[PDB]
DNA sequence: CGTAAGATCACGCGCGATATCAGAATCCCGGTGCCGAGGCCGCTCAATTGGTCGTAGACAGCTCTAGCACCGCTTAAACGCACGTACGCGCTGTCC
DNA sequence: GCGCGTACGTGCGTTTAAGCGGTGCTAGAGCTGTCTACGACCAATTGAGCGGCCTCGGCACCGGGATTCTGATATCGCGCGTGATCTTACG
């Protein structure tokens, strides 16, 4: 099944909560689309690295260690999923 | 006559951005490096190439920091960089806490 | 790109400023050398709009 | 500490994203979970820097130019 | 010593950085920031030189120090 | 005839753009020297091949477990409108 | 600091697809047995990059001449304000 416009699956209340955890009190209107774009770029890069790692692995499934490796590459090391 | 304030500053901006030579006179910087190093280990000797590399890195870092500071000041509708600008830029960079 | 820049600056021998211009002007090379400072490289000419005279 | 982004829309978004790099790709649920954790930590940090920018503008409401400034200063593109 | 980084030298550096107008407290703040940066880089360089059992801090020690700090420099035998 | 209100022309005053002088910037060119670049010769020191061994990797076959899909159920989550109120934007005074 | 326009919060109403469970099918990952290609090393061979030493020049520097660019001022133009002349209305 084709996938389309899933970036709007990131609803306004989700981004609002996320900013709340970031200490933001008042949020402007057009912010939400820009957070969608920024999340889009970040996901693009991280999943690019993970997909390349899977491709070398000759596997048809992305594994958690692939994500952890990609995050370590981006200077964004993550604990709690191995590695 | 008199040049209106702010014009000669733009002229220097044009002048220095077209050139690459170091903007800190060597000997005071060398003495500062020697003083700083002395606190870590005594009777130390420095290669001139090492000192030059230190100056290049420091000046480039300062220029980048000033660029970020100017951007931050402009974001505040301002034209003059002020210490809060450097502090905010360093904070967002993550070097200052 | 460095030889191109040197031709633009009308020079026969490539000097580091040519290298800095070539790397920073090119978006992809600039991204590759994102954490590299080139000695005697200088900076690109860039003045913010609001700083310009009216 | 519980996640703020809802799990299923995020999973659909990630599946679309990966499909555009390469088709016929499957995911371990743990891999999707790690992706979501990384994304949430990143954007919470980004919102913190944005709020710092907005206060610097003598403002209280974060505005898109604030995130642009923060990402420029971060060195992101 | 630290004051040897003259106010006008800081103005020249800012001018190369594109700054038009500069505050008075700026200069002292920049002196502090430069002090911190030099402290860190020279600390790493000394650590390296000590590990080299040499009384001369060399250029490669400096290059390795900036490489650690994610501030890689070119033109000194990288 | 005589006075009062209105339209138009002439004259005077005020704000903005664009002709000129003038000192500081910038570019170009005649003519010289140089320290760095370039090439040739020697010399070590580096690359390559005859030929061997274990080593890692490739391949094939048996096992199966989480990965994927749908259906039903339940409901927390998402979207539109009244409004008014603090926030955003714009003008202005002061003096650092 | 003052003044005015307004974006969106809370609340309410309404609607819906996201999680739990329940079932069902299953893809390629993971774990044994076969089979084979190759790189380190040793001898021996051969040859190329580095350094020393020559030779040469693109550009800095000096000095001079020529072309450009803000700061100041003044005229042209347009817009607003005032008096004179012609017009209309009232007495």
Swiss-Prot record, chain A:
Modified residues (N6,N6-dimethyllysine): 1
Cross-link Glycyl lysine isopeptide (Lys-Gly) (interchain with G-Cter in UFM1) placement: 12
Record-listed N6-(2-hydroxyisobutyryl)lysine modification sites: 12, 25, 40, 58, 60, 72
Stated role: Core component of nucleosome. Nucleosomes wrap and compact DNA into chromatin, limiting DNA accessibility to the cellular machineries which require DNA as a template. Histones thereby play a central role in transcription regulation, DNA repair, DNA replication and chromosomal stability. DNA accessibility is regulated via a complex set of post-translational modifications of histones, also called histone code, and nucleosome remodeling.
Protein name from the UniProt record: Histone H4
Modification sites for N6-methylated lysine: 1
Keywords, sorted A to Z: Acetylation, Chromosome, Citrullination, DNA-binding, Hydroxylation, Isopeptide bond, Methylation, Nucleosome core, Nucleus, Phosphoprotein, Ubl conjugation
Subunit text: The nucleosome is a histone octamer containing two molecules each of H2A, H2B, H3 and H4 assembled in one H3-H4 heterotetramer and two H2A-H2B heterodimers. The octamer wraps approximately 147 bp of DNA.
GO terms assigned for molecular function: DNA binding; protein heterodimerization activity; structural constituent of chromatin
Compartments, as annotated in UniProt: Nucleus; Chromosome
Covalent cross-link site, Glycyl lysine isopeptide (Lys-Gly) (interchain with G-Cter in ubiquitin): 72
Family membership noted in the UniProt record: Belongs to the histone H4 family.
Annotated positions of the N6-glutaryllysine modification: 12, 40, 58, 60, 72
Residues carrying N6-succinyllysine: 12, 58, 72
From Swiss-Prot, chain C:
Subcellular location field: Nucleus; Chromosome
Post-translational modification N5-methylglutamine, affected residues: 40
Modified positions (N6-succinyllysine) in chain numbering: 31
Coiled coil: none
Domain of life: Eukaryota
Post-translational modification: Following DNA double-strand breaks (DSBs), it is ubiquitinated through 'Lys-63' linkage of ubiquitin moieties, leading to the recruitment of repair proteins to sites of DNA damage. H2AK119Ub and ionizing radiation-induced 'Lys-63'-linked ubiquitination are distinct events. Glutamine methylation at Gln-40 (H2AQ104me) by FBL is specifically dedicated to polymerase I. It is present at 35S ribosomal DNA locus and impairs binding of the FACT complex.
Family to which the UniProt record says this protein belongs: Belongs to the histone H2A family.
The protein, known as: Histone H2A type 1
Protein's organism: Xenopus laevis
Lineage: Eukaryota, Metazoa, Chordata, Craniata, Vertebrata
């Amino acid at each position: 099944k084709v996938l389309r416009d899933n970036i709007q699956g990131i609803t306004k209340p989700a981004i609002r909560r996320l900013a709340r955890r970031g200490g933001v009190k008042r949020i402007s209107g057009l912010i939400y689309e820009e957070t969608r774009g920024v999340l889009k770029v970040f996901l693009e890069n991280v999943i690019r690295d993970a997909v390349t790692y899977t491709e070398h692995a000759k596997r048809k499934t992305v594994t958690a260690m692939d994500v952890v490796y990609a995050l370590k590459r981006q200077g964004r090391t993550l604990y709690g999923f191995g590695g | 006559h008199r040049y209106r304030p702010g014009t000669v500053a733009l002229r220097e901006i044009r002048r220095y951005q077209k050139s690459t030579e170091l903007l800190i006179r060597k000997l005071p910087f060398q003495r500062l490096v020697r003083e700083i190093a002395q606190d870590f280990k005594t009777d130390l000797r420095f290669q001139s190439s090492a000192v030059m590399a230190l100056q290049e890195a420091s000046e480039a870092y300062l220029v980048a920091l000033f660029e970020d500071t100017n951007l931050c000041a402009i974001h505040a509708k301002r034209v003059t960089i002020m210490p809060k600008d450097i502090q905010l830029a360093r904070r967002i960079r993550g070097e200052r806490a | 790109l460095a030889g191109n820049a040197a031709r633009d600056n009308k020079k026969t021998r490539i000097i580091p400023r040519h290298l800095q211009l070539a790397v920073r002007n090119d978006e992809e090379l600039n991204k590759l050398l994102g954490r590299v400072t080139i000695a005697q490289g200088g900076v690109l000419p860039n003045i913010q709009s609001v700083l310009l005279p009216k």
